[PDB]
């Protein structure tokens, strides 16, 4: 009854960040240090705990949120950060209890001529609240003129595509990200270490 982390980390396709995927993980055994004992992860930063302790701790639930961003935006997947991703796409709380894991996926998510299938929200009226997901597709009214669902002057389509080409600079190459949040309710804990 090992936690199905291979389903999330070793998934063929990843979600666009604006529609980030969330998988619940419950009633399982979580040997965390299969990860972290992996040099494949260019980012592995835990905030509420440190992961070698997590094989000794139990949680009610663990949420795995997965998506794809570009390199220089990995810094935004952290509490108290600003930028397009942190403000409009995926927001972590300041009291974040969990881990952020990320790796370079240039060989999978880039294509000759450019992969344009991964999207991010470029415009929004307000910032997201922590763990809020906005998959709306309303034309963004930048000026005083209503848009009536038609993109044009001062009326922007809210989602933009990443331009992932293999020869992009590392800051513009795709990165796959999994955010594990550890939910402790006043109910029986269901996920644990060995």
């Amino acid at each position, epitope marked *: 009854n090992l936690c199905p982390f291979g389903e999330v980390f070793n998934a063929t396709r990843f979600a666009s960040v604006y529609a980030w995927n969330r998988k619940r993980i419950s009633n399982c055994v979580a040997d965390y240090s299969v990860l972290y004992n992996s040099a494949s992860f260019s980012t592995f930063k835990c905030y509420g705990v440190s992961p070698t302790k997590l094989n000794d701790l139990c949680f009610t639930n663990v949420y795995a949120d997965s998506f794809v961003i570009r390199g220089d935006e990995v810094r935004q997947i952290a509490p108290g950060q600003t930028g397009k991703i942190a403000d409009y796409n995926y927001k972590l709380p300041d009291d974040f209890t969990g881990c952020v894991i990320a790796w370079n996926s240039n060989n999978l998510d880039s294509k000759v*001529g450019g992969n344009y299938n991964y999207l991010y929200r470029l415009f929004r009226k307000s910032n997201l609240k922590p763990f809020e997901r906005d998959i709306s597709t309303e034309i963004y009214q930048a000026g005083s003129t209503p848009c009536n669902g038609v993109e044009g002057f001062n009326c922007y389509f809210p989602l933009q595509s990443y331009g992932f080409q293999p020869t992009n600079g590392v800051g513009y190459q795709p990165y796959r990200v999994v955010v594990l949040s550890f939910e402790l309710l006043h109910a029986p804990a269901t996920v644990c270490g060995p």
Partner: antibody
Framework: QVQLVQSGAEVKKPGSSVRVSCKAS????????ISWVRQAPGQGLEWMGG????????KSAQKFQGRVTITADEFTSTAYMEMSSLRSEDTAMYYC????????????????????WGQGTLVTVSS | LVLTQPASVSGSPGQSIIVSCTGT?????????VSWYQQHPGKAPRVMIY???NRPSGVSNRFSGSKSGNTASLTISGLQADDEADYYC??????????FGGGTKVTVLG
């Protein structure tokens, strides 16, 4: 650098079905409306229908409903037009046409503003 | 439904000509979504005007568009031999479809 490249011309027997493809390159595919427009030899343009891939929404002219299917493969950046029970009056040049702008969800499929076109595919219905 | 265009319009070099396109209140007269396309032989159409009078970048300012009632018009100024082509109007409809006009062949005389 958006480019629409369509599949090659062909002949099809009456009553059979045809699939025309149009691969989009060099830009976003899922968020832009794509339309199919046909032109009989020496005749005028006629809009067949359109699709917005990310919304999964489509619309065809009534004369083409039940006979024409317009689909999209977002992973290969490719739009498709399929026509069944081909008649000789279906002999035409079939064009892929991307909308020059995008629309919000719940609004239009196409308002008739086409920026990029495919090179066209000649379908000849004959025995 | 076919929007009504003149079959033929002719002018001399430097002359200004007008291609009309008449629909109904359920299409041309119901929306601002009228476009104008130029098609040379053996080529795909190319949008010259959209939303009645907006001109895309790269289109010469000799082309302009207008609309009143159920009739839209494409005015071509400073007629040149390379303007010789088929011109089609397009319109949104109250059925949420797009319909084209029958086309107008523009020829430069003289």
């Amino acid at each position: 650098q958006v480019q629409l490249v369509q599949s090659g011309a062909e002949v099809k027997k009456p009553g059979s079905s045809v699939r025309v493809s149009c691969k989009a390159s060099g830009g976003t595919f899922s968020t832009y409306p794509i339309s199919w427009v046909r032109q009989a030899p020496g005749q005028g343009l006629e809009w067949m229908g359109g699709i917005i891939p990310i919304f999964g929404t489509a619309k065809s002219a009534q004369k083409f409903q039940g006979r024409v299917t317009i689909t999209a493969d977002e992973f290969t950046s490719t739009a498709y037009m399929e026509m069944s029970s081909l008649r000789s009056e279906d002999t035409a040049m079939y064009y892929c046409a991307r909308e020059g702008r995008r629309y919000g969800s719940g609004w239009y499929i196409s308002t008739g503003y086409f920026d990029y076109w495919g090179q066209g595919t000649l379908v000849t219905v004959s025995s | 439904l076919v929007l009504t265009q003149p079959a033929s319009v002719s002018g001399s070099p430097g002359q200004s000509i007008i291609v009309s396109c008449t629909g109904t209140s359920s299409d041309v007269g119901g929306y601002k979504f009228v476009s104008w396309y130029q098609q040379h032989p053996g080529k795909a159409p190319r949008v010259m005007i959209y939303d009645v009078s907006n001109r895309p970048s790269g289109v010469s300012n000799r082309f302009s568009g207008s609309k009143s009632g159920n009739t839209a018009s494409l005015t071509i100024s400073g007629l040149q031999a390379d303007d010789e082509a088929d011109y089609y109007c397009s319109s949104y409809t109250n059925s949420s479809t797009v319909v084209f006009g029958g086309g107008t062949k523009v020829t430069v005389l003289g």
